[PDB]
Design a protein around this nucleic acid. Structure first.
Lengths: 78, 108, 49, 95, 205, 149, 108
RNA sequence: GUUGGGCACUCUAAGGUGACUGCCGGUGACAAACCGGAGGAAGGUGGGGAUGACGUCAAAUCAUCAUGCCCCUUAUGACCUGGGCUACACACGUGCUACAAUGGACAGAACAAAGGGCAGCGAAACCGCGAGGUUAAGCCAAUCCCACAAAUCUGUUCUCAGUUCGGAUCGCAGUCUGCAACUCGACUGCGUGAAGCUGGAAUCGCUAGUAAUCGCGGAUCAGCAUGCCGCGGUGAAUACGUUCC
RNA sequence: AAGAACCUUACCAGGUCUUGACAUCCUCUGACAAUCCUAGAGAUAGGACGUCCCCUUCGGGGGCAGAGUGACAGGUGGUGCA
């Protein structure tokens, strides 16, 4: 829902809030493709599971509001 | 000429505004209401005063190249993140979860 | 015993089969049909319409 | 007193009401004779798709037959006699 | 294939086993019934019971188990009955009753008949013979038709194929004809074999 | 084996003509008899306003000119391929009258159907247009191969 | 007054003739309001026209169910069936027009 | 009906009756039949569904299930998380909406049936452009709620245009459901407005409440319908004939 | 099988458990357990917190769980020319 606000897994948001205590530094691996990219994520590289491997996606400004799985395409086709 | 668009003369105003990119039926309806002018009058039968008022209301809206650019910078933005939707934009495939096997021809 | 309520799915409470289940009876089309025949389903008779 | 009877066989449901009415009339209270209420028709349609689109139909049906029995000018013996009566396993006696 | 004769003749000439109204309790009262009848089978696998009629009355659940061996069913002083009840009392949750009547002439009931043939085929009695005992017993019982079938690897015969010895008439054309039907599976050392047994027992007029 | 009876239509309430009703039912689309009842009563007011005659005088005249007298029927006994001249039964005359009237009225250039149907009736009544031509056409064709029958 | 139940489809018209001037009032409205079609109105009057009782009786119908066509047929049938209570001499003239038959054409 | 009001009618549904060539004309074995009478709601097999025989394809299913013997048996057992099943060069099926005017929009009228509901239906007020949100009436019920129709009829405007035709697609918008709608829901804004100017060769099917057409409800189901199953409304044309297939 | 987001689900990729998910017993019979703290993507974990089985002439047994236990259990892996 949209009254409840944007969604993010609390397991992930904790990991990134620990990095926000320090200066980015570590790179978080997660399976929460469904988590919304908040402003707090900006500057991080997030390792997101695409079904087999973790895709390293650098988080920029325009990526805020989207989900993490928008940047980790699950199906290979050329 | 309204928002840099020669709206047709013979057809009614509401219709003539639908040609203006960024104005549809319901926008044209609440334009002419906000203009305080009859929505049944004709473009050929309007006044230059009434045109001015219509033109003043439409300046508050994003229309034509202003809107075309807004839309185009979004196409930029999605191909500037390699998002699923971005890739679907550049590949010419459906971007909102439509199936491709058949019935995707508008995109293809 | 699923984690969330959504995951919980209707299974044939006799068969165990998780398909085709009739919420009134909690049976798949199969286990029901058979029991309907035998006539162990209080007032559910075969129809002609 | 207002009684609602519900059954899957209208025969036993009629034989019930007969006694419910007769026990109230021997008890002496005036009876509104068993109102037939709109019989409920739950139909269950099990389809087995053949060639995908053709589909062998098999329909089953449950009918709840209903009867309403009002008892006017009720008596102590009536209220008793109603609880005394044994309506069978296929009838639901609601008061 | 064919319509199950019972299937199409319930509430018409034959009756419900499960005699009870219940609205919101339907599934509770139903799946209970399914345990009760599945239990009495596994328990009384040898007592010649078929029509396990189940009535209900809030918490007074009655189970009539019609039995061709009623003296055997009761047990030594209601020994089998009482032990049966307490389990059912502890399983179902209610006051499980045990009214009992007899299946006079076991060869009139098609379940019992098909159960009899179920054992003969396990003990390796020639398909041929197994049926013929029933057929003739059912004739003398007083039945206007019979159609025992056995189908499967018959005698261990590599190729499975069906063998039916049919006497009298099997009037499936007649909705008022009392065609009993009962299937059964015969698990030998070559798979399983199908005991199907029809019995026309005089018209229901 | 025995000729099925044709369905007895009611008379058209304002012209008391079962012919006019049959036209309505011919014009009716998707069981919208209302649309067709309107169209005809609109078309007949158009005929009466133009001509001054009663629409019934014109419509019956229109049908006379559309209604076929002889038709071509394919006969292939051995070889043959004979277009047997067949006399149109009086029911099949009206059939083909109303069919052609409606079929060609729908094809006309005029904007509304009430005008299109009015103009096809007015043209049919003047022994001209397309629906009258169609009758001529099959008669010209029936006259052409008249040596069979 | 002379009562007669009509039924077509799911319509059920409780027709009642009363001494009047040929007014058909269905559920407290003039027939023209309730049934729009003229063709349907003529067909509803068809029993009154053949007995020549149009202008003799006020028809007071109570209808419920089906549509406008359906409602017509039930009224027609119910007028016809009301007239039979008014005068048994009409039976011959009604029966000739097929007005006393109940059209039992249900959906398949 | 809102209420008192026997309850007439209608409806509800238990039990009945009713169609039989029965009766009457002709006809013909004086009979059967046939032709036509009446009476009746029904006429000459009342109309629908239900229920057949012995068949064969060692037809199909060990991905309903079970199954004798194989195999796997720290895995050919099992559990989780993410993903795929929703890919798309294309093909073969099923289907829906358009290709306008007998239409589109605009408003005023309407007239349905069947079915569902308490872990719910939710009135009605209220809030928002809307989808929805608020709180909560009444009611597991012929009692209350969902539904209470749409096609259509009557006002009005556009005027045969790629169009107030058409709706795809995309951009930006919101709202529910769920732990979560990125892949991959539905719905509603708002703009955009593709193809389509009504589908050949060919092929199938259909004799009436049918074809065509317009809505409704329900199962499955948190949500998800251009599918399925009901239900009702409107409602045809044609059947001469057996010449041919 | 036009009611697959998860579940379903069988497939995949990776994580993981191995009387193994469950399953009969064998017995041993405790509590079983809720539980919420910490992890983890979650399973899988360790534990914060939390164990009282009832019936039992109070022996045992019915259980449930864990352990032991044992063949097995269990396979959408084969064979529909078993």
């Amino acid at each position: 829902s949209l009254k409840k606000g944007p969604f993010v897994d609390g397991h992930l948001m904790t990991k990134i809030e620990k990095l926000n205590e320090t200066d980015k530094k570590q790179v978080v691996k997660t399976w929460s493709r469904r988590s919304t990219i908040f402003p707090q994520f900006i500057g991080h590289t997030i390792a997101v599971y695409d079904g087999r491997k973790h895709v390293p996606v650098f988080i920029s400004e325009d990526m805020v509001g989207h989900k993490l799985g928008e940047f980790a395409p699950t199906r290979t086709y050329k | 000429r309204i928002a840099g668009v020669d709206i047709p003369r013979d057809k009614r105003v509401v219709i003539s505004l639908t040609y203006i990119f960024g104005i549809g039926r319901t926008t044209a309806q609440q334009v002419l209401k906000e203009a305080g002018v009859s929505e049944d009058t004709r473009v050929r039968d309007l006044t230059e005063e009434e045109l001015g008022k219509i033109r003043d209301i439409i300046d508050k809206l994003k229309v034509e190249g202003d809107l075309r650019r807004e839309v185009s910078l979004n196409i930029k933005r999605l191909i500037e993140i390699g998002s699923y939707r971005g890739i679907r934009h550049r590949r010419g495939l459906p971007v909102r979860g439509q199936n491709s096997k058949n019935n995707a021809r508008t995109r293809k | 015993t699923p984690k969330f309520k959504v995951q919980e799915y209707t299974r044939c409470e006799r068969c165990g089969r998780p398909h085709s289940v009739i919420r009134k009876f909690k049976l798949c089309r199969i286990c029901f049909r058979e029991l309907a025949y035998k006539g162990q389903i209080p007032g559910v008779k075969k129809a002609s319409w | 007193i207002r009684i609602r009877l519900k059954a899957y066989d209208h025969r036993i449901l009629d034989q019930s009401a007969e006694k419910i009415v007769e026990t109230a009339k021997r008890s002496g209270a005036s009876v509104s004779g068993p109102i037939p209420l709109p019989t409920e028709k739950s139909v269950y349609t099990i389809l087995r798709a053949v060639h995908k689109y053709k589909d062998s139909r098999e329909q089953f049906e449950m009918r709840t037959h209903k009867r309403l029995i009002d008892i006017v000018n009720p008596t102590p013996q009536t209220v008793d006699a109603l609880m005394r009566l044994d309506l069978p396993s296929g009838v639901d006696i609601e008061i | 294939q064919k319509v199950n004769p019972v299937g199409l003749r319930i509430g018409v000439i034959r009756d419900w086993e499960s005699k009870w109204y219940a609205g919101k309790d339907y599934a509770d009262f139903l799946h209970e019934d399914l345990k009760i009848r599945e239990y009495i089978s596994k328990r009384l696998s040898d007592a010649s019971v078929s029509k396990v009629e189940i009535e209900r009355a809030a918490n007074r659940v009655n189970i009539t188990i019609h039995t061709a061996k009623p003296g055997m069913v009761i047990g030594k002083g209601g020994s089998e009955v009482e032990a049966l009840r307490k389990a059912l009392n502890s399983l179902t949750g209610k006051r499980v009753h045990i009214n009992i009547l007899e299946i006079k002439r076991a060869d009139l009931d098609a379940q019992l008949v098909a159960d009899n043939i179920a054992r003969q085929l396990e003990n390796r009695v020639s398909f041929r013979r197994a049926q013929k005992q029933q057929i003739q017993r059912t004739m003398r019982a007083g039945a206007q038709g019979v159609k025992t079938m056995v189908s499967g690897r018959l005698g261990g015969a590599d190729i499975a194929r069906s063998e039916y010895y049919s006497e009298g008439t099997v009037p499936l054309h007649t909705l008022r004809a009392d065609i009993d039907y009962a299937t059964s599976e015969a698990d030998t050392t070559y798979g399983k074999l199908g005991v199907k047994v029809w019995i026309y027992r005089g018209e229901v007029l | 084996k025995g000729p099925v009876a044709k369905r007895d239509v009611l008379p058209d309430p304002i012209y008391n003509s079962k012919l006019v009703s049959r036209l309505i039912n011919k014009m009716m689309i998707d069981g919208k008899k209302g649309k067709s009842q309107t169209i005809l009563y609109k078309s007949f007011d158009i005929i009466k306003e133009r001509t001054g005659n009663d629409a019934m005088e014109v419509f019956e005249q229109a049908l006379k000119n559309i209604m076929p007298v002889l038709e071509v029927k394919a006969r292939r006994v051995g070889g043959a391929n004979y277009q047997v001249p067949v006399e149109v039964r009086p029911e099949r005359r009206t059939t083909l009258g109303l069919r052609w009237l409606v079929n060609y009225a729908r094809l006309r250039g005029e904007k509304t159907m009430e005008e299109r149907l009015a103009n096809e009736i007015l043209d049919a009544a003047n022994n001209t247009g397309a629906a009258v031509k169609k009758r001529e056409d099959t008669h010209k064709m029936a006259e052409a191969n008249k040596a069979f029958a | 007054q002379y009562y007669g139940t009509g039924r077509r489809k799911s319509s059920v018209a409780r027709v009642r003739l009363v001494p009047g001037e040929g007014r058909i009032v269905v559920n407290n409205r003039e027939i023209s309001e309730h049934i729009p079609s003229a063709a349907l109105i003529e067909d509803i009057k068809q029993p009154l026209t053949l007995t020549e009782t149009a202008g003799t009786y006020d028809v007071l119908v109570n209808v419920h169910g089906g549509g406008l066509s359906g409602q017509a047929g039930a009224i027609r049938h119910g007028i016809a069936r009301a007239l039979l209570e008014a005068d048994p001499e009409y039976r011959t003239t009604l029966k000739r027009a097929g007005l006393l038959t109940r059209d039992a054409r249900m959906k398949e």
